[PDB]
């Protein structure tokens, strides 16, 4: 393992998610319809943490994460998912190397500063010890030019990866507009995932990435004639979006619609019981000499 | 494995002949929940979780949905909507030793009950009282795991039983584990009873003009009922229409 120290220490950046992060929630074709689904989605216009240099600490993984990268020269290498990441617990390693994509759910002893080096690939300094392998998979690969979006979920024993590749043309930002992420792979791996880390490929390259978090939300998805999702409504973004979901339409006529219910939520738990201290004589029942 | 640290063998991408296991004489308990044991060979599942452990004979009844005790609340909890079969057999001739086989263990204590399919392999001292234990075995501070002293002279309820549980996962995804059924030729433009990778129904199969994405296995109408299916052998998209009906 090698610890890289020649790095400037700046605070994390933040950006606006806009309408990104919508994915196909299931494997069923439907077309020319509006479908209401309750699932883990990236909320619209959410605060997305933005990282650049060689900026890649371990981040929390809660219900799931949204990951996006803007690159021009293939710097991204992969991800580490796990609970402790130090061979004490099971961990998931996803690496896209020069020739293919490898997924391994072996028990890895990770480095405290993992990375790859490169133009041809040479260095691989991700882990040392690796035994107790449980799952392996290999497959086809995957201003700035390339935008890559991924959704990572860990539900009911499956780790679901969704992805979209698009062109980009901004120097320093995330595009506005709508696209849907198709599912890439469903891995049947029952891993407790609470933390993750990004693998990047001395000098620094030109690349940036964004990390958002999924929440339980209801989305109204618009399927076109060819069954492609072309729009969506986040049913809790604003009162209009809620109205659109309630009427199951993306067009709302003039009028007044009853769309929800307001309720004040409790902030404290008040527990009151009699101030008695004597214990019940259960022991005397159980340990009696004669029954 | 010990029940506190039970083994799971994920089973996928294969043909599952369940008639061999069900019609075997070597098994004493074979209880299925959510499916019937005689229809298993006609079904397809996305994934099968083969879970295996050794328990005491009296505890065999605890390997069921909705049960309470030490093995259920602390070693191998099953969900109430469990689909699968709990196959179990007496293994006294394999697991017993004269002085007692102390390799098989179970968790006796825990702060809270185990959620479904939650393995717990810690050995942290259990605090029974209000006084912190700080890692030291003593009064109100117990060792959470205990061994079964399996001896050949023990009664039937205390003999070792090996348990294999088979969890059948059913989510809207491609099925990978199917029974030993023979496939037939595809017939189109006629009313037939069809079974497409576990999906069953009656209708007329026609060639579809729908542009299915590479990951989509079937389709649904505005009504949220199945109206198209991808054939499991040739990746052809078929439309399913109901067989002609109407009032008389």
């Amino acid at each position, epitope marked *: 393992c090698v610890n890289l120290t020649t790095r400037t220490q700046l605070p994390p950046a933040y950006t606006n998610s806009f309408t990104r992060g919508v994915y196909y929630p299931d494997k069923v074709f439907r077309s020319s319809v509006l479908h209401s689904t309750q699932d883990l989605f990236l909320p619209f216009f959410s605060n997305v943490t933005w990282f650049h240099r060689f900026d890649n600490p371990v981040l929390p993984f809660n219900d799931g994460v949204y990951f996006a990268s803007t690159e021009k020269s293939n710097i991204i290498r992969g991800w580490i998912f796990g609970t402790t990441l130090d061979s004490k617990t099971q961990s998931l390693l996803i690496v896209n190397n020069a020739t293919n994509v490898v997924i391994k759910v072996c028990e890895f002893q990770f480095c405290n500063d993992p990375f790859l080096g490169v133009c041809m690939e040479s260095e691989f300094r991700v882990y040392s010890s690796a035994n107790n392998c449980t799952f392996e998979y290999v497959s086809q690969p995957f201003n700035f030019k390339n935008l890559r979006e991924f959704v990572f979920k860990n539900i009911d024993g499956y780790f679901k990866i969704y992805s979209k590749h698009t062109p980009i043309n901004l120097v320093r930002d995330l595009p506005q507009g709508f696209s849907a992420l198709e599912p890439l792979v469903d891995l049947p791996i029952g891993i407790n995932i609470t933390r993750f880390q990004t693998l990047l490929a001395w000098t620094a390259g030109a690349a940036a990435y964004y990390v958002g978090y999924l929440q339980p939300r209801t989305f109204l998805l618009k399927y076109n004639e060819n069954g492609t999702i072309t729009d969506a409504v986040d049913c809790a973004l604003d009162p209009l979006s809620e109205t659109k979901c309630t009427l199951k339409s993306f067009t709302v006529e003039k009028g007044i619609y009853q769309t929800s219910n307001f309720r004040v939520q409790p902030t404290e738990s008040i527990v009151r019981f009699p101030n008695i201290t004597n214990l019940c004589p259960f022991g005397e029942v159980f340990n009696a*000499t004669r029954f | 494995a010990s029940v506190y640290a039970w083994n799971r063998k994920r089973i996928s991408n294969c043909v599952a002949d369940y008639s061999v296991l069900y019609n075997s004489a070597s098994f004493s308990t074979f209880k299925c929940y959510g499916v019937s044991p005689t229809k298993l060979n006609d079904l397809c599942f996305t994934n099968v979780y083969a879970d295996s452990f050794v328990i005491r004979g009296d505890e065999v009844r605890q390997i069921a949905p909705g049960q309470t005790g030490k093995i259920a609340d602390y070693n191998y909890k099953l969900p109430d909507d469990f689909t699968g079969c709990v196959i179990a057999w007496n293994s006294n001739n394999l697991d017993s030793k004269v002085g*007692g086989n102390y390799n098989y263990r179970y968790r006796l204590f825990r702060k809270s009950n185990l959620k479904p399919f939650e393995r717990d392999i810690s050995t942290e001292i259990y605090q029974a009282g209000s006084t912190p234990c700080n890692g030291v075995e*003593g009064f109100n501070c*117990y060792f959470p795991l*205990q*061994s079964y002293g399996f001896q050949p002279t023990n009664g039937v309820g205390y003999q070792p039983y090996r348990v294999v549980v088979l969890s059948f996962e059913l989510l809207h995804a491609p099925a990978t584990v199917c029974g030993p059924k023979k496939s037939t030729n595809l017939v189109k433009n006629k009313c037939v009873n069809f079974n497409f990778n576990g999906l069953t129904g009656t209708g007329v199969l026609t060639e579809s003009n729908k542009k299915f994405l590479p990951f989509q296995q079937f389709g649904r109408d505005i009504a949220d009922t199945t109206d198209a299916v991808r054939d499991p052998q040739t990746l052809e998209i078929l439309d399913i229409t109901p067989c002609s009906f109407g009032g008389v």
Partner: antibody
Amino acid sequence: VQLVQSGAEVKKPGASVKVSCKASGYTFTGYYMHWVRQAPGQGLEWMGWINPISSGTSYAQTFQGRVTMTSDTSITTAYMELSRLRSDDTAVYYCARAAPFYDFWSGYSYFDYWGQGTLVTV
Amino acid sequence: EIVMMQSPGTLSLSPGERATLSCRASQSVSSSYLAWYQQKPGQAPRLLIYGASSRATGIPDRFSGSGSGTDFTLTISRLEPEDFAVYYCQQYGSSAWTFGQGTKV
């Protein structure tokens, strides 16, 4: 329930002695093994205990730092190792079976089965 | 620590009579932690009474116990030649097991 101990041993001062206790007729790891010392003409003195499931121990303050207790579940046998012997340690050593501390009834407060004593002369 | 004192140090009586032995403690003792043992000469001790008054399995009804607080007693209704042995009281407290000095019968 039977507990069978090794034969008598004679040791010089400063030496160490190991006394075995083989258990049968019950689940070995389900009970604590205690050791009790009886000097000739004297009463019984508790030395400590071993929990076979975890190889946990506790020792009396009198013998803390001098005695090690171990067990081997495979052969259902407990062992005593008493180091730094002095002439005052000549005694009959008994192994005793007691319930673990989690017994709802106070089964850990008393010894229900005893093995035959092992005489150690120093 | 707690001092365990038995009385009388030596008992002398004839077969067929009743005997009472006493055990005193420095500090109050829960009834659940008091036990009596019989040790015959040349033999290992064996349990007679546990939980202050409960007879151990296999023990004749001639043996009984009673007591509370710091004062416990063991009574033998009728003695046989096998009963002329050493009797001990034992107590658990703190994280230790304490035995008395023993009484000879």
